[PDB]
């Protein structure tokens, strides 16, 4: 856990995890005399390692069931179910022919997502699914009014906007963006949330979060941009 | 709880409280905005009486209908009877093959009713169709003793009525007083409300009136009678 | 249905997502009529060319581009000129096959 | 870029002195346009209290504050009516200002004020 | 105050009658001389605080209707429900859950909540209740007092665990298989009838009967996949219930009225179809192949 | 079974992982009846929105979601208050199915 946030000497608490740690390597540095202790963490890193499932699956069974199967093994693990939007087209297919699954999860996980070409991840021990062209529900706003630095730095399909890091920002979402350029720039509003970026310090560099979005279209679908074969 | 809103005028002055100084003694802009808003806040009064017009013991109409079909007892039911027919006895007496309402009668329904049509008795009076869902809270629950029936029969009818024998598979009720003809009628309907448990047959007693007999609460010479339980035939024509 | 913002300029060009195409629209006010006009572009081919801007119809219903309607709507039917059209007395709307279809039916 | 076209309800004072919305001659709401509605907006902006407004504490003119006590100055006096006034959304300039104080009354008058809007 | 709740229902206040109501307030603040036409500054304000109290109106038949389970629908019509605590099934409809909840007629709104809770078992695909509440034995067989299930599906332990804390002690069961059921010790034995399907083979003889000339009758198969639907509906022939002419042409006549039914045949395959009926002892019941079904238009 | 933590904001949001589920709660004070209610959304899906914070009941029951149940504890049975309910005078549980049967077996 690595709970961020603003505690203002009025107002309240804005304090939550923006990263749910397990250790990667840690390590003392000296400069001058001081001990600053360098750790680095792990991401469903216990799924990406220890996670192997044993499947038997049959003809006929529909296509999500066995995202249900997999996330068992995953779930031995300690990963948690986040929300699963699959493509229309995953949503209605069936079976001709068995389903082989030896091996490593991740690794046919990414076989996965290249051949049905949808996104999965893990947040904070958590483990989301989404399509390549959508999203999730829940929006958040970035305008001069809330938190925007600079720019909503424009860019072939969206944006990539720099604000305070503020924890709600996550992969998978909305984020409806306002300044005084963008109207000239005639972008949206509305993008989808693909990378996010933290970099903040409790002294001098302020919080700062770095959000890269690729543009929703006018058919509530994202901009994919042209995936090479 | 307790009084969930209150007049519009308060809540109206409550607002124009927060009117800025150069307002304040404006009559024509404060009498403008009151006018404006007012009229919301007295259309929003009326939903205060969506709290007690679906209280179970002073329900009426739309309302009690509601609580019926929540309760799961409709307010009509399919039955062996001749339903009166609202119309005319060509004035003195026709021949005919229907009877006849006249501004007093339960069986409320003219030719063309749907629920007329296929058989359908639909209680008209409120009175009776709310006894018949207080009783009907019984069988919800399956209150089939007789310390919980007797309060059925109480609602129902009257506080003369009473439960008389328990035979094997046959139990006996009375309302404890002569009935009237909207409540005869109604009888049918009254033993599928009432809580008695499936596979025994509710009977009733032939002259509605007291049973006698020995022992601390029943009724002697003048008021009891002779038992004799008969079929409402609630659910059968035969 | 979405709503297309109209910049306070004589000549402008933007680009929208409709039925999975990607559109651009170039509109530019006719002075000596006082009219607006708009070019559309599918996939960089100008398949529209020239074509005034009025309110209450579909202005693609002739040409059968597979992207719906786009059509301008106002209070009291009050034709775009250049000072309403920017404004958004007068607006431009964009509506799918299957919206207009279900409104239809409603 | 012309000047964009304001409309808002119109002011004008009764016998009493107190500023009160208006229907005209013909009996509808008179309105005010691009210049009166400017002039009225900018007077109901100075007539405004600091902390007065329950939605926004920031809006108003901080009178109790400044420039209402045993301080008369007229050089914050004039600083503070001018920023209201420019605050004012439509008014380009301030061309003249004079102030003065009558003892007597304990009177801050500020007079000879004239403004020019984006409309000229 | 004829508007909002009223014996009748919610009764709504005319959006002509807010206007009617605004513009009389402004009559008495500015005078007869006041213009509210509907174009002017007054009169686009009375429109749209107008059209405001209306939609408060609007909100008032909402939260009115939110308590009547004919107009209450999704986590609000489960609410209601959990009145009586029935439970709805997966992937159940509105119109079937309320259907529930109203105990539409039903023949007996008794033993309603042991047809529904048993509906309500996973697994159960369809369940029918009797009671036999006389002196005597009826024709079908049930012995006096006594209440007989039906079912198909579901576990046995659930099945009768349910059954049992609805038929009170001192009341038999009527059936052909036998549940052992045991709380705090005691063992009462419940008795469940689990229909034996017995394959029909139908074979129907129609004729045309063009409503006015219009539209003709639909083809043979058009007619038998929806018999065969109708037939193995939630309205499919029950236990006890014989093959009879009379079973087939209400089918036939009100899936399509223009069809008249000359000639209905049964069987118990794969015997050859023969004149009915078809008799079904209560522990049987008739079980229908897409295949079997037969419909032949006669001149 | 955990503590979920309320702060003294008259509207509030947070995340939590119940049963591995990421299940979003918001509360929201109203005045007029001075009382909290919350909204939980499974996963970005809104199912359960304006239900009013009650103490001793579970307040899931009636929908069926799987994520156990939320329910509202204080000493002397007070009802959850503007004031009372950020103060910790009133916690928000939550209690995992296996713990509650543990418990009543118990």
């Given at each position: 856990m690595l709970e961020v946030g603003y505690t203002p000497p009025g107002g309240g608490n804005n304090i939550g995890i923006i990263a749910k740690g397990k250790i990667r390597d840690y390590q003392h540095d000296r400069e001058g005399g001081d001990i600053i202790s360098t750790v680095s963490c792990g991401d469903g890193d216990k799924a990406y390692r220890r996670a192997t499932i044993s499947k038997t699956i049959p003809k006929g069974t529909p296509l999500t069931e066995v995202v249900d199967e997999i996330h068992k093994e995953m779930k031995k693990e300690g990963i948690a179910k986040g929300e699963w939007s699959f493509p229309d087209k995953v949503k209605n297919t069936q079976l001709k022919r068995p389903y082989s699954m030896c091996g490593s999860c991740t690794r046919e996980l990414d076989t996965?997502?290249?051949?049905?070409?949808?996104?999965?991840?893990?947040?904070?021990?958590?483990?989301?699914?989404?399509?390549?062209?959508?999203?999730?529900?829940?929006?958040?706003?970035?305008?001069?009014?809330?938190?925007?630095?600079?720019?909503?730095?424009?860019?072939d399909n969206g944006i990539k906007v720099k604000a305070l890091i503020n924890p709600e920002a996550?992969?998978?979402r909305m984020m409806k963006v306002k300044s005084q350029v963008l109207k000239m720039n005639r972008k949206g509003e509305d993008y989808r949330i693909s990378e996010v970026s933290f970099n903040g310090d409790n002294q001098e560099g302020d919080w700062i979060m770095t959000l890269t979005g690729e543009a929703i279209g006018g058919d509530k679908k994202v901009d994919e941009g042209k995936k090479a074969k | 709880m307790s009084n969930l809103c209150a007049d519009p005028e308060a809540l109206v002055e409550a607002r124009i409280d927060e009117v800025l100084t150069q307002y304040r003694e404006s009559p024509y802009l404060l009498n403008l905005i009151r006018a404006y808003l007012?009229?919301?806040?007295?259309?929003?009064?009326?939903?205060?009486?969506?709290?007690?017009?679906?209280?179970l013991d002073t329900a009426v109409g739309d309302q009690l209908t509601i609580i019926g079909r929540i309760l799961g007892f409709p307010r009509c039911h399919c039955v062996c009877d001749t339903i009166p027919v609202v119309g005319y006895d060509c004035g003195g007496s026709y021949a005919g093959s229907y009877q006849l309402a006249g501004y007093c009668e339960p069986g409320s329904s003219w030719i063309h009713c749907s629920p007329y049509g296929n058989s359908e008795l639909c209680v008209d009076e409120d009175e009776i169709y709310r006894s018949l869902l207080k009783a009907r809270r019984y069988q919800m629950l399956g209150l089939y003793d007789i310390e919980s029936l007797h309060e059925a029969l109480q609602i129902v009818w009257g506080e003369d009525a009473m439960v008389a024998e328990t035979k094997v598979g046959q139990v006996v009720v009375t309302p404890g007083r002569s009935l009237t003809?909207?409540?005869?009628?109604?009888?049918?309907?009254?033993?599928?409300?009432?809580?008695?448990?499936?596979?025994?047959?509710?009977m009733i007693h032939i002259d509605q009136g007291p049973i006698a007999g020995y022992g601390d609460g029943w009724a002697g010479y003048c008021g009891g009678d002779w038992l004799c339980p008969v079929d409402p035939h609630a659910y059968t024509c035969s | 249905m979405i709503e297309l913002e109209v910049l306070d300029e004589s000549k402008q060009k933007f680009s929208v997502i409709l039925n999975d195409r990607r559109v651009t629209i170039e509109l530019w006010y006719n002075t000596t009529n006082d009219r607006w006009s708009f070019s559309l572009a599918l996939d960089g081919d100008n398949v529209v060319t020239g074509r005034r801007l009025v309110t209450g119809v579909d202005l693609l219903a002739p040409f059968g581009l597979g992207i719906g309607a786009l059509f301008l709507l106002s209070e009291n039917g009050e034709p775009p000129t250049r000072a309403n059209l920017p404004l958004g007395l007068v607006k431009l709307y964009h509506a799918t096959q299957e919206e207009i279809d279900a409104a239809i039916s409603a | 870029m012309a000047a964009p076209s304001r409309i808002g309800l119109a002011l004008k004072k009764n016998e009493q002195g107190i500023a009160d919305i208006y229907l005209d001659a013909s009996g509808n709401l008179s309105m005010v346009q691009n210049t009166e509605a400017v002039g009225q907006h900018a007077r109901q902006r100075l007539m405004t209290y600091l902390g007065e407004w329950f939605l926004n504490k920031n809006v108003g003119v901080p009178w109790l504050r400044d420039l209402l006590g045993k301080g008369y100055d007229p050089v914050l006096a004039e600083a503070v009516i001018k920023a209201e006034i420019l605050s004012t959304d439509?008014?380009?300039?301030?061309?003249?200002?004079?102030?003065?104080?009558?003892?007597?009354?304990?009177?801050?008058?500020?007079?000879?004020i004239e403004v020019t809007t984006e409309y000229d | 105050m004829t508007y909002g709740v009223q014996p009748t229902g919610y009764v709504k206040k005319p959006?002509?009658?807010?206007?009617?109501?605004?513009?009389?307030?402004?009559?008495?603040?500015?005078?007869?001389?006041?213009?509210?036409?509907?174009?002017?500054?007054l009169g686009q304000l009375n429109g749209l605080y107008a059209d405001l109290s209306y939609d408060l109106d609007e909100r008032g038949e909402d939260l009115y209707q939110s308590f009547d389970p004919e107009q209450a629908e999704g986590s609000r019509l489960d609410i209601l429900a959990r009145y009586r605590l029935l439970s709805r099934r997966a992937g159940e409809s509105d119109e079937s859950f309320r259907r529930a909840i109203t105990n539409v007629d039903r023949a007996r709104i008794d033993l309603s909540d042991l047809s529904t809770a048993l509906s309500a078992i996973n697994g159960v695909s369809w369940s029918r209740v009797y009671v036999n509440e006389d002196a005597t034995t009826d024709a079908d067989g049930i012995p006096p007092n006594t209440v007989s299930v039906a079912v198909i599906g579901?576990?046995?332990?659930?099945?009768?665990?349910?059954?049992?804390?609805?038929?009170?002690?001192?009341?038999?069961?009527?059936?052909?298989?036998?549940?052992?059921?045991?709380?705090?010790?005691?063992?009462?034995?419940?008795?469940v009838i689990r229909p034996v399907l017995i394959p029909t083979s139908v074979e129907i003889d129609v004729q045309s009967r063009p409503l006015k000339n219009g539209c003709p009758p639909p083809s043979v198969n058009a007619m038998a996949a929806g018999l065969y639907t109708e037939l193995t509906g939630p309205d499919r022939p029950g236990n006890g219930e014989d093959g009879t002419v009379y079973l087939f042409r209400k089918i036939m006549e009100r899936l399509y009225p223009n069809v008249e039914v000359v000639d209905v045949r049964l069987s118990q395959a794969p015997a050859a179809p023969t004149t009915p009926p078809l008799v079904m002892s209560f522990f049987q019941m008739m079980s229908f192949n897409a295949d079997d079904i037969l419909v032949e238009i006669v001149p």
């Open positions: 996965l997502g290249r051949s049905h070409g949808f996104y999965w991840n893990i947040q904070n021990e958590t483990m989301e699914i989404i399509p390549g062209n959508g999203h999730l529900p829940g929006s958040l706003l970035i305008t001069p009014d809330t938190g925007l630095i600079g720019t909503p730095t424009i860019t996550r992969p998978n | 007012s009229k919301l806040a007295e259309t929003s009064m009326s939903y205060c009486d969506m709290v007690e017009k679906f209280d003809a909207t409540e005869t009628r109604y009888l049918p309907i009254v033993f599928r409300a009432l809580p008695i448990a499936p596979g025994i047959k509710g | - | 439509g008014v380009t300039e301030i061309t003249s200002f004079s102030i003065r104080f009558d003892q007597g009354r304990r009177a801050l008058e500020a007079f000879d | 959006l002509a009658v807010h206007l009617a109501e605004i513009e009389a307030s402004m009559v008495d603040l500015f005078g007869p001389g006041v213009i509210q036409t509907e174009q002017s500054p579901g576990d046995d332990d659930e099945v009768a665990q349910l059954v049992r804390r609805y038929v009170v002690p001192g009341v038999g069961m009527y059936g052909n298989t036998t549940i052992e059921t045991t709380i705090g010790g005691f063992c009462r034995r419940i008795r």
